[model samples]
Target: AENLPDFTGLVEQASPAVVNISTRQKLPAQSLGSGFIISPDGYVLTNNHVIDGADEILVRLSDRSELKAKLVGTDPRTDVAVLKIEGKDLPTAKLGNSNTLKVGEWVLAIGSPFGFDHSVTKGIVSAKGRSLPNDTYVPFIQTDVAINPGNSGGPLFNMAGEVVGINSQLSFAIPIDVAMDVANQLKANGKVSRGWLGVVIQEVNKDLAESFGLDKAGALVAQVLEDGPAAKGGVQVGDVILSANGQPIVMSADLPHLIGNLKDGSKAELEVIRDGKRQKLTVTVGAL
Candidate 1:
């Protein structure tokens, strides 16, 4: 009982930055989610899907003040959105480095779920670098926090009350570092640019692993686009990419996460197993 940490102070410090988000569309129905203020001047961060297709977005502060938010930008691939509200001296959340976040660490989320505003949930990080279907660009941080529909755009905080991730469903969160990068890009460029490797890849299953004479799973090249980055750089079909830029590709999903982080036209070194031989290939990334 002596060492059990209390969340009272953390909640007090963090909740001021959390807000309830409601979106109205062309029709009567309005949707709800959560968001957090990232800057004092009113830059808010939320999930793209939360405000997607909405005609208007409203942010309710803890003080019960509602402000109309203007869309700054949205990155659908990463499910992050940046919103701008007209406010001065707004409370803001401090962002943490997700790269330093360890698995099983205690984390918490603040959101509005089912129209309940500022609902708080606490849980431990279940896993890190999780790759979900159709979300290959984000290596999600998996938590056991009770995230729900209205909680889609909330912030996932560490014990220190720093925003470590943006809570999404499946209890997944886009890492704060990724979210922050997207937020900055949205604010500056009004859009996010991501690197792309022009090749279709699949997981190296056990059968394919054996066929390739490999002992481990990697990203197997299924198709190289014609005259695309991969094809122009000598990548061929059937090559098993073992590593990218020295990072191990333990699964097919790992490849996209790596490539999406680089700039377009950047050169990447791929360690591939071709015809039972390990070789290095250089491929230029394309714009996504």
Candidate 2:
């Protein structure tokens, strides 16, 4: 094979920004994970679960030097946490556009898998916009990368060596776009807030699509709460939500992530199919 897409270049370029995070809790127990610096001034991004209940947090750089990190903020809904480490001229990760990532495209993850520093794993993106039961706010990027216990907060890099996600569990990664947005808010607000749509929705499958006389599938609005944004904005039950803010809703799960991205009180332009005809409605988003 023609070298099978060499990753040496990528590892060499991106590894300096990757870091190992260790935490000490009650008793003699210690936990480990990975994170990456996002700024030369030392803003590290990681998962909330990594340092949630720890009394002490330490960050190890690629050169093996250690520094104490301060908890910046965390959003448990998305499982993202931001940390502040005091440093100048630190190595930083280059973020990529997760929205442009295509399924099956190769990606590389750098982390401390099982406490092995700087371990690298490679795999293709298995899927995108994955909605986990508890993480409705984040549309995860699913990958086949060999994620392990210590890899949970590490960076998943695209072919361009830009960070596209923060690795989670054994497969899913929070999209960089959402991670950065949460990171920014956490850094500024010390908390996270999300927009909510007062509508119960379901996926428009084959039978439902046929019954609705639709040529394409969408998110079906099953119930709109009385006096809620959707109801107040003229959104009716039995309407199929075709798109939100111009992005197509291929499934019902897609709507939440879209709406959650908007700020409270922001206007959301929704495209819906009512009685087999397209209708546009504007609803003011509410805080979650």
Each candidate structure's count of clashing pairs: 0, 0
Local accuracy of candidate 2 as per-residue lDDT tens digits, 1-288: 365558999999999988888876664425468899999999999999888877688888867778889999999988999999999989989999999999999999999644426889999999987655453346789999885768889999999999999997649899998899999999999988888888878777788888767785568888788877888799988889888889988878788878877899998999998888888999988976
Clash pairs, candidate 2, are none
Per-candidate TM equals: 0.86, 0.81
Cα TM-score of candidate 2: 0.81
TM-score of 1: 0.86
Best by TM-score: 1
lDDT score for residue 257 of model 2: 74
Residue clash pairs of candidate 1:
none
lDDT of 2: 0.86
